[PDB]
Amino acid sequence: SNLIEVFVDGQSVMVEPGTTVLQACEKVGMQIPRFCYHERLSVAGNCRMCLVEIEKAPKVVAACAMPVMKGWNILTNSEKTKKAREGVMEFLLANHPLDCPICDQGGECDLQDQSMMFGSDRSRFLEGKRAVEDKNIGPLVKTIMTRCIQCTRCIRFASEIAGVDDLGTTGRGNDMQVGTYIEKMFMSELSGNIIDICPVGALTSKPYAFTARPWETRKTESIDVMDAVGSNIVVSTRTGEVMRILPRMHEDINEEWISDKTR
Amino acid sequence: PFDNTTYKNLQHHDYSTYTFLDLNLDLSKFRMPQPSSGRESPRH
Amino acid sequence: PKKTSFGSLKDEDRIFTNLYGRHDWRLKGAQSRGDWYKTKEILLKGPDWILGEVKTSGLRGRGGAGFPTGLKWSFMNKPSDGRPKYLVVNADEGEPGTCKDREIIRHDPHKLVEGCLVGGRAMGARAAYIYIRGEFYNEASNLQVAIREAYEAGLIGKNACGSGYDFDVFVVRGAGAYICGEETALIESIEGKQGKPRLKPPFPADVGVFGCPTTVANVETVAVSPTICRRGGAWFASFGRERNSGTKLFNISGHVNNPCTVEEEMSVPLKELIEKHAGGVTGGWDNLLAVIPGGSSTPLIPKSVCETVLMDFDALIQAQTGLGTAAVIVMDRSTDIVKAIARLIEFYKHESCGQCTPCREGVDWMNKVMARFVRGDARPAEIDSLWEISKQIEGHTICALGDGAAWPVQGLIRHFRPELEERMQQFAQQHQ
Amino acid sequence: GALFVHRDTPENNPETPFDFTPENYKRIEAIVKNYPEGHKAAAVLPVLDLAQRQNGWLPISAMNKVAEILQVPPMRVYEVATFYTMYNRKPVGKYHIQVCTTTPCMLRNSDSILEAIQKKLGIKVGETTPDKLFTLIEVECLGACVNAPMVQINDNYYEDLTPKDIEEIIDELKAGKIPKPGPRSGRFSCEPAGGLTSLTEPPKGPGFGVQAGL
Numbered sequence: 019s020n021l022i023e024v025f026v027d028g029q030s031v032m033v034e035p036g037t038t039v040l041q042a043c044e045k046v047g048m049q050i051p052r053f054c055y056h057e058r059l060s061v062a063g064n065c066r067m068c069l070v071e072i073e074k075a076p077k078v079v080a081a082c083a084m085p086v087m088k089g090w091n092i093l094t095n096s097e098k099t100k101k102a103r104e105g106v107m108e109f110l111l112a113n114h115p116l117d118c119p120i121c122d123q124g125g126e127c128d129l130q131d132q133s134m135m136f137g138s139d140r141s142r143f144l145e146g147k148r149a150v151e152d153k154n155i156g157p158l159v160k161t162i163m164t165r166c167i168q169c170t171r172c173i174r175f176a177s178e179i180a181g182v183d184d185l186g187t188t189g190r191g192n193d194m195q196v197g198t199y200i201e202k203m204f205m206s207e208l209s210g211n212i213i214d215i216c217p218v219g220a221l222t223s224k225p226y227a228f229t230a231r232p233w234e235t236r237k238t239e240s241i242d243v244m245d246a247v248g249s250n251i252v253v254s255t256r257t258g259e260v261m262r263i264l265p266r267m268h269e270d271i272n273e274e275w276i277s278d279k280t281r
Numbered sequence: 282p283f284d285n286t287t288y289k290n291l292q293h294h295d296y297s298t299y300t301f302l303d304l305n306l307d308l309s310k311f312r313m314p315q316p317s318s319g320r321e322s323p324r325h
Numbered sequence: 326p327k328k329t330s331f332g333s334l335k336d337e338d339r340i341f342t343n344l345y346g347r348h349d350w351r352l353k354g355a356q357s358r359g360d361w362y363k364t365k366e367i368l369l370k371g372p373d374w375i376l377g378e379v380k381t382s383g384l385r386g387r388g389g390a391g392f393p394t395g396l397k398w399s400f401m402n403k404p405s406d407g408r409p410k411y412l413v414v415n416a417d418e419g420e421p422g423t424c425k426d427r428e429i430i431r432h433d434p435h436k437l438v439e440g441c442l443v444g445g446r447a448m449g450a451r452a453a454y455i456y457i458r459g460e461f462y463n464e465a466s467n468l469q470v471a472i473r474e475a476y477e478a479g480l481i482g483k484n485a486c487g488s489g490y491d492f493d494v495f496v497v498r499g500a501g502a503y504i505c506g507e508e509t510a511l512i513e514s515i516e517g518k519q520g521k522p523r524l525k526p527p528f529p530a531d532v533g534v535f536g537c538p539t540t541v542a543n544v545e546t547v548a549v550s551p552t553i554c555r556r557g558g559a560w561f562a563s564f565g566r567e568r569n570s571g572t573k574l575f576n577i578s579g580h581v582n583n584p585c586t587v588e589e590e591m592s593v594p595l596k597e598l599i600e601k602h603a604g605g606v607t608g609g610w611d612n613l614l615a616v617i618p619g620g621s622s623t624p625l626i627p628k629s630v631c632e633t634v635l636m637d638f639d640a641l642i643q644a645q646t647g648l649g650t651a652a653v654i655v656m657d658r659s660t661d662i663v664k665a666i667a668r669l670i671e672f673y674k675h676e677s678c679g680q681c682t683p684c685r686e687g688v689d690w691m692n693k694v695m696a697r698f699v700r701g702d703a704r705p706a707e708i709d710s711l712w713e714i715s716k717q718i719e720g721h722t723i724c725a726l727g728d729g730a731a732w733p734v735q736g737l738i739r740h741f742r743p744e745l746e747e748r749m750q751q752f753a754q755q756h757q
Numbered sequence: 758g759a760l761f762v763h764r765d766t767p768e769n770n771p772e773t774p775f776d777f778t779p780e781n782y783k784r785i786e787a788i789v790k791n792y793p794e795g796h797k798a799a800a801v802l803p804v805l806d807l808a809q810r811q812n813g814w815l816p817i818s819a820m821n822k823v824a825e826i827l828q829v830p831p832m833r834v835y836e837v838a839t840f841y842t843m844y845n846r847k848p849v850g851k852y853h854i855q856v857c858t859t860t861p862c863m864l865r866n867s868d869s870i871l872e873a874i875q876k877k878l879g880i881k882v883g884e885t886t887p888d889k890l891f892t893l894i895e896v897e898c899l900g901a902c903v904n905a906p907m908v909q910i911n912d913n914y915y916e917d918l919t920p921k922d923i924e925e926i927i928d929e930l931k932a933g934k935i936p937k938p939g940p941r942s943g944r945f946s947c948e949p950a951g952g953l954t955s956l957t958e959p960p961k962g963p964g965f966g967v968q969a970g971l
């Protein structure tokens with residue numbers, strides 16, 4: 019009734035008012051690249067990896083944040099869209115450390131996998147990289163903040179879901195840093211969830227450090243029994259041993275979060 | 282009456298650190314009542 | 326009929342009659358110079374009439390973008406829901422080379438304060454927040470003193486000018502961030518957060534300061550509104566070419582004999598502006614290397630183009646640059662043009678807010694490359710690499726600062742590539 | 758040069774004594790009433806600056822105080838202090854010399870002004886003299902480009918400087934007095950040196966050029 023018709027690569031899709039370009043593309047099975055957007059956090063629109071071309075529009079729009087207007091044709095695979103992604107991926111990897119072998123995120127990194135699919139295959143950065151100081155926010159989350167890509171997922175999660183306004187951005191420009199400024203431990207019952215939402219190896223699990231790589235773990239879908247919520251989990255095993263516990267999505271029980279005791 | 286050889290803006294030579302806020306405080310009596318969103322803060 | 330040459334504006338047609346502070350800036354000096362005259366009639370005329378006068382006036386924003394003011398101010402001329410409506414006056418002048426807004430505040434404060442009321446009445450706003458950068462402490466105090474005089478005279482506040490319209494004027498000081506000149510970063514700073522621009526949509530006219538409808542107008546764009554309403558839109562539109570009408574404030578700075586701020590008609594040829602008001606280039610017009618027509622954000626142009634180029638939005642677009650804030654930065658042949666523009670990239674690296682990737686990581690990247698072009702510690706194949714890097718920042722960023730960092734580099738490569746490659750050849754010979 | 762992480766030190770920590778004077782609490786009450794009810798966080802920038810004017814700089818205790826007065830989480834105050842450059846998170850000299858060095862001031866030999874101060878005070882850029890009297894830093898455009906190399910001391914602009922003139926300002930500041938602010942080359946403002954080129958006729962009084970309808 020109140021749906022409006024938009025086009026994704028020419029294919030018609032009916033969407034509700036206020037639906038974003040990123041969400042319109044989901045209905046046709048297309049997943050726009052992303053680093054800062056999470057469907058359970060507020061929109062930020064800072065990583066700029068979701069830039070997509072709209073036919074007849076000179077300027078690329080941010081799919082995560084741009085509401086889709088009636089009659090728009092979203093070009094998710096045009097040259098302008100492909101060049102936009104390679105440009106953003108080039109900037110995103112410019113100051114990034116060559117830590118993949120020693121980084122716990124290697125093999126399940128949203129920066130690695132979107133560099134292989136949407137970025138360029140080589141570097142033209144001839145300068146010196148930027149290194150940053152490491153914060154200590156507790157005995158659960160290990161912070162190697164040279165890997166941070168300033169996406170602010172942890173900031174929005176710690177604030178909107180855990181209700182703890184202890185993480186923020188200090189500095190400005192290329193020296194902007196995510197942290198607590200003061201020496202403070204991020205100890206909430208949901209603190210361990212910033213490990214998952216962080217798309218890079220900046221925030222990893224200290225108990226799990228260096229113990230496994232994602233490809234070699236076997237995934238068993240089970241139920242948490244630490245409380246009466248019955249959270250759905252994934253039990254990661256390797257060679258007969260339990261390596262870690264990850265959340266498993268369930269919209270009606272736990273969404274994609276678990277408590278620290280469960281984790 | 283057409284004196285144009287004098288810089289008629291010299292008051293600021295004597296302004297002090299708290300000059301700006303003192304003027305702001307003196308203006309509070311003229312302000313109209315502020316609007317209210319309906320809550321004491323976004324966190325309430 | 327329509328004019329063919331522009332310039333030589335008469336003092337009988339200059340809006341800012343106290344641009345140099347030679348008269349009394351306080352009230353009763355502004356009134357003697359035509360301010361606060363017959364303001365009640367303008368307010369009682371109606372918001373539609375005021376907007377109609379600004380639309381016919383052809384006035385365009387003096388902040389650096391030059392959008393049609395009359396069209397923009399009509400977005401707030403809509404039915405008022407429960408939320409209040411504000412007007413934000415952008416006195417955060419921080420664009421390198423720009424000083425016009427500093428003079429309006431410290432010498433003609435009552436023109437700005439009247440413009441707030443006239444602009445507010447057009448937009449149906451309840452109050453005006455004037456954001457002025459924190460380094461303009463003395464200027465902000467002058468503005469605050471003038472606002473007190475207006476309140477005591479009944480000009481603003483309860484029943485402004487006897488019009489029956491309530492309007493407050495608040496002055497808010499920034500804390501030293503050039504990015505807070507952006508219309509959405511300025512709003513965030515007023516709300517007590519970091520000066521990080523928002524994405525659009527929503528536009529400030531639908532969701533702005535405190536989440537309420539808002540319009541961000543530059544100091545010059547507002548200070549001229551009362552005069553336009555008094556003298557009509559026809560008088561203001563009679564200046565400059567079509568779609569470039571009005572009288573503009575210019576800041577000639579750099580390598581000139583008499584660096585000054587002066588008001589001059591739109592479309593005035595750049596050569597006439599420099600020679601007539603600034604006393605020519607240092608060393609003679611033949612000693613001119615390049616000019617930045619509208620502050621650092623605009624790309625430079627060489628001597629060959631300055632001889633027949635008019636100073637207006639349309640004329641400078643055909644020259645691969647922009648009018649910007651009408652700040653003219655002149656560089657003579659003794660200047661190190663590569664180092665002049667490299668320091669401009671270093672400026673943007675220091676003012677980038679860090680929010681978004683292409684400017685947090687790109688403008689810093691362009692800084693390091695430029696710092697190696699000054700010394701020639703690069704090979705010529707990097708010039709085209711620097712051209713592409715700039716094109717990946719331009720239009721891929723949240724705000725226009727990322728475009729403002731790319732454009733200076735593009736102008737340098739466009740008009741001074743031989744100087745770049747010569748510099749690298751010198752370095753290669755020595756360190757062979 | 759300025760780190761953005763706070764490590765506690767004896768002179769800077771949550772226990773360092775800070776509290777607004779009774780006079781400032783009256784000023785804060787006027788500031789907090791410039792904004793709609795329910796948006797007190799809008800007062801962070803003014804109040805956080807008012808703390809610096811009283812104290813000269815912002816220790817970690819000063820930030821925590823503004824957080825509780827406005828009822829905002831302390832981190833949201835740390836973000837503002839670290840974002841803006843006019844906030845001093847370390848002690849500075851009572852005279853903070855800020856020499857503009859952006860291109861328009863650079864083209865008019867602002868390097869000579871910088872050399873003049875470094876020789877006279879014997880300090881490098883970013884250092885404080887060994888008497889807590891002067892601190893020197895380079896800053897971006899201060900909005901006075903039309904004026905030749907200019908500096909800012911605290912709240913005053915000293916314009917059209919030359920290496921000779923800037924040294925006099927330091928001498929005048931050194932003993933007891935506050936030098937007059939503004940150009941130091943015979944000008945008064947942005948006016949063109951060598952005689953005005955515009956606004957040379959008596960300004961027209963009220964009611965001039967007014968259209969018939971209005």
Ligand SMILES: Cc1cc2nc3c(=O)[nH]c(=O)nc-3n(C[C@H](O)[C@H](O)[C@H](O)COP(=O)(O)O)c2cc1C
Pocket residue numbers: 385386387388389390391392394415416417418419420503504505506507508509541542543544546724725726729
């Ligand atoms: C990085 C940056 C800095 C800006 N600084 C200013 C400024 O200092 N003063 C101003 O009036 N506009 C400035 N602008 C332009 C504003 O975004 C916006 O165009 C202006 O506030 C609208 O006023 P107008 O109607 O006069 O054009 C800046 C834009 C950017 C991207």
Ligand code: SF4
Pocket residue numbers: 114115116117118121122123124125127128129130165217218219220
């Ligand atoms: S975060 Fe990803 S790209 Fe960066 S070092 Fe770790 S695995 Fe490699």
Ligand code: SF4
Pocket residue numbers: 165166167168169170171172173196215216217218220221
């Ligand atoms: S630490 Fe991770 S989640 Fe937080 S801003 Fe950096 S990349 Fe994003």
Ligand code: SF4
Pocket residue numbers: 504521522676677678679680681682684685722723724725726727728
């Ligand atoms: S372009 Fe630069 S200044 Fe503008 S929002 Fe992005 S990071 Fe901030």
Ligand code: FES
Pocket residue numbers: 051052053054055062063064065066067068069080081082083
């Ligand atoms: S996913 Fe849209 S800018 Fe980050």
Ligand code: FES
Pocket residue numbers: 421422423857858859860861862863897898899900901902903907
């Ligand atoms: S460049 Fe120095 S005041 Fe503008």
Ligand SMILES: [K+]
Pocket residue numbers: 123212213214215216217218219220221222
């Ligand atoms: K992670």
